[PDB]
Write a protein that binds this ligand. Structure first.
Ligand SMILES: *[C@@H]1O[C@H](CO)[C@@H](O[C@@H]2O[C@H](CO)[C@@H](O[C@@H]3O[C@H](CO[C@H]4O[C@H](CO)[C@@H](O)[C@H](O[C@H]5O[C@H](CO)[C@@H](O)[C@H](O)[C@@H]5O)[C@@H]4O)[C@@H](O)[C@H](O[C@H]4O[C@H](CO)[C@@H](O)[C@H](O)[C@@H]4O[C@H]4O[C@H](CO)[C@@H](O)[C@H](O)[C@@H]4O)[C@@H]3O)[C@H](O)[C@H]2NC(C)=O)[C@H](O)[C@H]1NC(C)=O
Ligand SMILES: *[C@@H]1O[C@H](CO)[C@@H](O[C@@H]2O[C@H](CO)[C@@H](O)[C@H](O)[C@H]2NC(C)=O)[C@H](O)[C@H]1NC(C)=O
Ligand SMILES: *[C@H]1O[C@H](CO)[C@H](O)[C@H](O[C@@H]2O[C@H](CO)[C@H](O)[C@H](O)[C@H]2O)[C@H]1NC(C)=O
Ligand SMILES: *[C@@H]1O[C@H](CO)[C@@H](O)[C@H](O)[C@H]1NC(C)=O
Ligand SMILES: *[C@@H]1O[C@H](CO)[C@@H](O)[C@H](O)[C@H]1NC(C)=O
Lengths: 133, 153
């Protein structure tokens, strides 16, 4: 089963985003595709940045949220996944989130164009530093 | 055309305005919207005072010089479990909500209904203020002074 391979810490700051600031990206990455046609997608994490930060992902299907993901990173570890919280009330048709990784499995009958109808809204916020006024 | 404006209570004069149920306010429209409410884009100091009086949202909105989100309680999907005022790095063309500061509001929390856009002007739009209690107040007019905002729909 697909799961992240932890990269070495390569960068120790997030390019262009200072402590006290956040940035958002709407995209997803194809992690793997199986012989049966099922595709597995991830939020678009930058996996080699070791900065003190927290992140949310939201799986967006046709501009409606199906659930949210929480991550953290530090000066010692790249982004680490801390769980998925479902927000959908109807059962998902042809989709399944792996609760161990936050990856989204898209079965072939869910849609012919997953890359156009689905994305993750990934928000990274660089934790503020405590200083004097 | 119709414009719906959902407004929060005021906290040290600061309130949040969401247009049409989605992120839909440009930088230029945000200032014009606050001015129609006889208000201005908050300074960061005004936002921090509002936060200390009970103001938080889970939405990005314009203030003077930045787009921000104010947080009191940690929530994993609102500035990713942070507290304080966090600033969003964004293109100047992106649309968000807006914050506004009313100088005649009380120092604490004011949840009375907002019943008018006092500085709206003539125009064809039905503009509806939607309050937290469910009451809505509608008038015909306009508040956008930039033709680009009107043309962009
Ligand atoms: C195209 O092919 C790909 C590749 O084969 C398929 O991908 C698979 O997709 C399925 C889901 O459709 C994945 O299965 C699910 O995996 C969950 C996670 O499992 C892992 O973690 C748990 C906990 O640590 C372990 O127990 C698991 O161990 C299992 O696997 C190892 C080896 O991998 C074995 O040694 C074990 O014996 C186990 O077999 C994994 O390590 C897992 O939690 C989930 O299990 C639930 O669902 C099944 C039935 O679907 C039940 O048998 C099971 O008891 C669980 O039941 C709970 O949930 C159901 C669903 O709501 C409820 O009804 C129950 O009441 C209960 O609450 C499931 O097994 C699988 O991981 C994944 N494989 C890979 C390689 O990625 C695609 O599906 C396929 N596409 C199509 C369209 O068929
Ligand atoms: C996103 O929305 C589109 C449009 O509603 C969905 O496309 C429909 O998919 C169903 C599959 O049951 C087809 O029967 C319809 O003909 C499709 N409609 C159109 C206009 O293409 C799409 O499935 C949705 N995506 C997901 C993943 O839910
Ligand atoms: C202390 O100095 C800091 C710069 O070295 C910075 O100006 C800081 O202000 C805070 O910075 C945070 C990000 O690290 C947030 O943006 C926060 O909103 C902001 O007040 C200074 N702290 C104080 C208390 O003034
Ligand atoms: C980390 O760096 C070493 C040294 O270059 C390399 O051999 C190794 O593959 C890397 N490890 C990981 C987990 O990426
Ligand atoms: C799609 O396939 C899944 C998995 O077998 C199934 O649960 C779902 O009902 C199918 N139908 C549609 C229309 O998605």
């Amino acid at each position: 089963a697909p799961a992240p391979k932890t990269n070495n810490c390569t960068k120790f700051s997030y390019p262009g985003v200072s402590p006290g600031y956040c940035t958002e990206r709407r995209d997803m990455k194809l992690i793997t595709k199986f012989k049966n046609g099922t595709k597995v997608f991830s939020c678009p994490l930058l996996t080699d940045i070791c900065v003190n930060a927290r992140m949310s992902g939201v799986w967006c299907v046709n501009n409606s949220a199906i659930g949210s993901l929480f991550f953290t990173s530090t000066s010692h570890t790249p982004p680490m996944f801390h769980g998925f919280t479902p927000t959908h009330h109807r059962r998902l048709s042809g989709l399944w989130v792996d609760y161990q990784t936050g990856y989204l499995y898209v079965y072939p009958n869910a849609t012919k164009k997953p890359e156009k109808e689905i994305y993750c809204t990934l928000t990274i916020c660089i934790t503020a530093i405590t200083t004097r006024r | 055309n119709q414009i719906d404006l959902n407004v929060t209570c005021r906290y040290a004069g600061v309130f949040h305005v969401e247009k049409n149920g989605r992120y839909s306010i440009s930088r230029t429209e945000a200032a014009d919207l606050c001015q129609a409410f006889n208000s201005t884009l908050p300074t960061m100091d005004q936002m921090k005072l509002a936060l200390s009086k009970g103001f938080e949202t889970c939405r990005y909105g314009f203030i003077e010089g930045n787009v921000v989100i104010p947080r009191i309680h940690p929530n994993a999907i609102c500035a990713a479990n942070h507290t304080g005022v966090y600033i969003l790095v964004t293109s100047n063309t992106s649309h968000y909500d807006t914050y506004c500061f009313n100088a005649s509001a009380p120092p604490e929390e004011d949840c009375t209904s907002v019943t008018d856009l006092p500085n709206s002007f003539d125009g064809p739009v039905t503009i509806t203020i939607v309050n937290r209690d469910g009451t809505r107040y509608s008038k015909k007019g306009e508040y956008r002074t930039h033709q680009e905002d009107i043309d962009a729909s």
